[PDB]
Symmetry: C3
Subunit: 340 residues, 3 copies
């Protein structure tokens, strides 16, 4: 598998983690992820340097992760801090690899490449997730596809018109206005849907109001595979910036070449103290993201062998510009990294 | 990934198909099989030309299959007939592969190979299946073995008659014994014949009459036994019978629709699936099967298949 | 992948075998194992020479294994003895491979390698299993690891302080002493565990305990777990001699034959229960979970050239591992 290792990836949502380790593989690298007694998250290679047992099946002893096999103890920097055996000697050979972690924007970011190069300034901005003006709900999904298929999915949100038609179909789809803005390490795909009846989802945002609206569904990509969308709806002619909206976290992290982790969320500026609106967004996430999109991209992954064996290449449509530009940027990053 | 692609295979029974597409893989080729509003069956490659979504997860829009991902619509010839996006242009690059398909003898026949060579006149004759003189019932099953194993099993006064892409194994038993099924409709002759056509389509003839009687006027069933490879190690099995006895008996219909009664009893499925699991060992150790006297027809068939494979190798 | 094929392996416990065949794969070789009416065990390649059906799914007819598919019948030497078809001729091509088998010490040993070379004198000694002075209970487990991982597990029995902490803990761990003695195709790790409080298990039979293990090539081990009052001679201890015998199934899976042969409470059903409970919990659950997890990490370890870092407890396991690697490479280079 080719992955871009010198980049930050979301490995977990903070609420997934505790003093009980979580074993999760990112970029074909098995990790043991836990929150220490002092609250700091650690990420260790989930392979004990002694005989390769899963540290993730161990427990904390004195805030130190104890290997379940012969009881070596490790701190969050991977240092072996206790060896129960013989003279108890702890040479550097017993230290386990530790991965840089930044807990930011209610995300656990990990750097899986050269730890010397881990630069917190490179972490994409998802500040809305911790902004008290936004209400955020979301979760985790596992998907049996190459993460690039879900990047493709997200970078053409037009797919919602079909894949999510029961919730997302608009009668103004024929009048979509698209632009693509290309920045440095960042690409935006903008979509405005002018003058339509609100979709079923947008009508729920508005609490049933069914008169004509403008809607937007923009998305921002940052390398490698972190996206933030803007789903918004307002009375015709009222500015974007004044709209009720959800900024959607859509972040992918490769697991294996043919599987990935999907971290999703909605950060909304409306109905902030409304458990029933929470439910609308959670049920949307459960149906759209973890069911419908999964089913499409997992089917596409199953067709990979045929496509490759037969030299089949995708045929592009007018809606693909942003997805293609992103795909080419990822490929470029992949090749740059394969040189190092 | 060794198949004989240049041949007609059954992909479905007609009763499986409707305006809701069926996704089924034959010879490692995923198909979307559906009936258009005019009744006519279409068979498209189950891979959208845009981004490779399963067209079989789509629905018809004005009789045209719509990709479930971004809404490209296709006709039964695979032509893209609507592009929702932008200027709506439909360059030839948006067309999807369509397979030669013939509905005949209550079977859906598909040609997975070189479409230039697909001659509908070469489709095997299963006419009994739509002959009103016969009551025809049957069904479908899936098996986790190479189809050749089931062909071998099927093909096991004798005579074996060998022709070009057809082989017949005939057996007559004078003073023979009615099958349990037929006994009650009767000093008998019995017949058990089977006909193979390339690659894996068989029709048997199981019959009993008073001695003397033209086997053509016997009490008899003609059994449909048609295999289609799914992967190298799995197959589809279409079975059925066309009978001239008890034609209005629904209980008889029932037992003749049973997979285990008519096609493959569980104990034999266990055996053939186990044989498939021994393939790796057999190949690694250069082990070849040892044939018995009962294998004569199966061997002849096996050799013809291998020749057809070898042709396609280049 | 690479196995030591020229060696005896346990393929079954005798109690697993009957006139109903058992299909089991050893060293990537599928076998049909059964007991003939005269009591003699046969082991045939589980691939009918006709069309490759599992003979192990058939039954015996007049003491002969009958293929379930078209009913060829075979004797214990693999000779085809009946062909129900045609003239019933039995050409030599119908015979099936039969493997050398020795039933000894309440074990079924099979030689999967060059049959010219199978010397029954080479089978290691597990005589306690049929010694009237000992009571033996045990069984079979399947494990999704390469057998060498479970050899490691068994040869460093100081994982029991952690993996088996609920049953096997003892404070005296601080003060382990462990002696490795190397012999010819045989390695032992010995151990006094002195003056200590007994582990939960020991209590179920201040104490001295011992926990020795003997390995013989390829992967056959017998341990010695013993406790006695402080100051008591190792040899007057109540003890269990543990059968711990591994046989490769595939590159990444194995068969585990375990047993306890004890010299105490030998008429006592409650003790049977303590031992069978330990075997169930320790060997088939806890150790299984660890080694199966390590197996899953193999791809990463190999891809990244990672080598193990050894501790003071590892000598015996390392010596054994070196001997197996040596046998494995000695064979593949011929
Ligand atoms: S494998 Fe971790 S201490 Fe031995
Ligand atoms: S994958 Fe079919 S329209 Fe996009
Ligand atoms: S496969 Fe055993 S008798 Fe035919
Ligand atoms: Fe979606
Ligand atoms: Fe253990």
């Amino acid at each position: 598998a080719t992955f871009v290792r010198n980049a930050w990836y979301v490995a977990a949502l903070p609420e997934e983690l505790s003093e009980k380790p979580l074993g999760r593989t990112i970029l074909d690298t098995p990790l043991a992820l836990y929150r220490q007694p002092d609250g700091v998250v650690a990420a260790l290679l989930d392979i004990c340097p002694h005989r390769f047992a899963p540290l993730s099946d161990g427990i904390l002893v004195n805030g130190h992760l104890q290997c379940p096999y012969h009881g070596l103890e490790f701190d969050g920097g991977g240092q072996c801090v206790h060896n129960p055996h013989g003279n108890g000697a702890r040479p550097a050979s017993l230290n386990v690899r530790s991965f840089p972690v930044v807990e930011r924007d209610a995300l656990i970011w990990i750097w899986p490449g050269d730890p010397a190069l881990a630069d917190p300034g490179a972490i994409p901005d998802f500040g809305c997730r911790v902004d008290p003006a936004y209400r955020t709900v979301g979760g985790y999904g596992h998907v049996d596809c190459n993460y690039k298929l879900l990047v493709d999915n997200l970078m053409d949100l037009g797919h919602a018109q079909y894949v999510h038609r029961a919730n997302a179909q608009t009668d103004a789809f024929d009048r979509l206005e698209r632009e693509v803005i290309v920045g440095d390490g960042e690409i935006q795909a903008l979509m405005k849907i002018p003058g339509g009846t609100p979709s079923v989802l947008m009508a729920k945002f508005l609490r049933g109001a069914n008169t004509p609206v403008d809607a937007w569904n923009d998305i921002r990509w940052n390398k490698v595979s972190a996206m933030l969308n803007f789903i918004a709806v307002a009375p015709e002619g009222t500015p974007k910036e004044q709209s009720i909206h959800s900024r959607g976290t859509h972040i992918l992290t490769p697991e294996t070449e043919a599987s990935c982790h999907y971290f999703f969320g909605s950060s909304r500026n409306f109905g902030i103290d409304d458990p029933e609106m929470d439910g609308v967004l959670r049920s949307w996430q459960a149906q759209a993201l973890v069911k419908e999109d999964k089913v499409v991209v997992e089917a596409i992954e199953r067709r990979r062998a045929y496509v490759e064996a037969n030299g089949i290449r995708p045929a592009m449509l007018s809606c693909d510009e942003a997805a293609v530009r992103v795909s080419r940027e990822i490929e470029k990053l992949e090749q740059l990294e394969a040189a190092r």
